[PDB]
Amino acid sequence: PNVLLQNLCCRILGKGEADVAQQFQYAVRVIGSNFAPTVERDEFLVTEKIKKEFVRQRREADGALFSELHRKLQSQGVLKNRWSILYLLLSLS
């Protein structure tokens, strides 16, 4: 936890330590007081939000393509907690 989140500041900001310190403070505060998910767990709802996003933008081909990509992610059987990963990538589109 403590290390990974600091790593996040460091790669984005492109600065080492004692440069990212204040930013660290915001990040720590904001992650810690809301640590655990505040939504009911459900892979399907997040997926649907990603495909509607494709349709709304009229990128139909990519919306179908996406469906193939999510099955590939799921199939490998390595990453669990998948909804949160997907969720994040959708919020930042």
Binding site: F44, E48, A64, S67, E68, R71, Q74, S75, G77
Partner: protein, 263 residues
């Protein structure tokens, strides 16, 4: 149960299940023989059966696509446009089954939202094959001309794909006859039929006519008579058609002024 979640997949491709059926042209309803306590989860999969029924009307259309050479030139160009949307319909069956083999169980209600986006698309292709029984060209142009005036924005997108490929043989006829004076017929699917009597050296004489009863509705009646005068003198994308026949009319009259110079 899991065996039913798979079984509904096959009925999407229009392929009869692993249970006995007495439907395939009525809907695609399955009777297991213990359908009695499956009367709530058989009823969900009876709504999905009705999607597989609408797939089969498009499929039998495609058996009429190509014969030893099926009647029309536009009749089959239409059928090419209808097979493309069937092809895209297959794409979601091909992700759906590949989820039903990962390290499995996909919920009936989850897959219902997956079949809802095809259910506004395929249903309006099956409505579009109902207006047509004949394949004769220009009938098909009046079908998509009758369906792009209708409400609902979601099938209006779908018929605009189809407008672009139905119309494309109409326009391939049109621009050759305006510029050089040359024509194409294969079955008399152009709205110009040829030889009312017999051919006669040009001076403008009755040789072509509008042939209403197979006219594409893309043109209005005074604009079909305009492009007739243009073609004898040389001798929405529905509304882009009437613009450039006005720009054709000025280029063909220079040619008509050259005929005075020969006499």
């Amino acid at each position: 149960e899991t065996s039913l979640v798979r079984d509904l997949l096959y009925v999407f491709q229009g392929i009869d299940g692993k249970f006995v059926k007495m439907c395939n042209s009525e809907n695609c309803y399955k009777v297991d023989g213990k359908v009695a306590v499956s009367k709530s989860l058989k009823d969900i999969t009876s709504k999905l059966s009705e999607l597989g029924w609408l797939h089969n009307k498009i499929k039998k259309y495609t058996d009429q696509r190509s014969l030893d050479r099926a009647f029309g030139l536009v009749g089959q160009s239409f059928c090419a446009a209808l097979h493309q949307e069937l092809k895209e319909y297959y794409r979601l069956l091909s992700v759906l089954h590949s989820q039903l083999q990962v390290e499995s169980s996909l919920t009936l209600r989850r897959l219902l939202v997956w079949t809802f986006d095809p259910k506004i698309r395929l249903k309006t292709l099956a409505a579009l094959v109902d207006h047509c029984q004949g394949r004769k060209g220009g009938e098909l142009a009046s079908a998509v001309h009758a369906y792009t005036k209708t409400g609902d924005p979601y099938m209006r997108s779908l018929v605009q794909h189809i407008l672009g490929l139905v119309a494309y043989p109409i326009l391939n006829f049109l621009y050759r006859w305006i510029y050089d004076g040359e024509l194409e017929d294969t079955y008399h699917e152009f709205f110009v039929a040829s030889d009312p009597v017999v051919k006669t050296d040009r001076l403008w004489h009755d040789k072509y006519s509008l042939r209403k009863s197979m006219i594409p509705s893309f043109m209005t009646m005074d604009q079909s008579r305009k492009v007739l005068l243009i073609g004898k003198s040389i001798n929405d994308l529905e509304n882009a058609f009437q613009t450039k026949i006005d720009a054709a009319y000025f280029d063909t009259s220079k040619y008509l002024l050259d005929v005075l110079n020969k006499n």
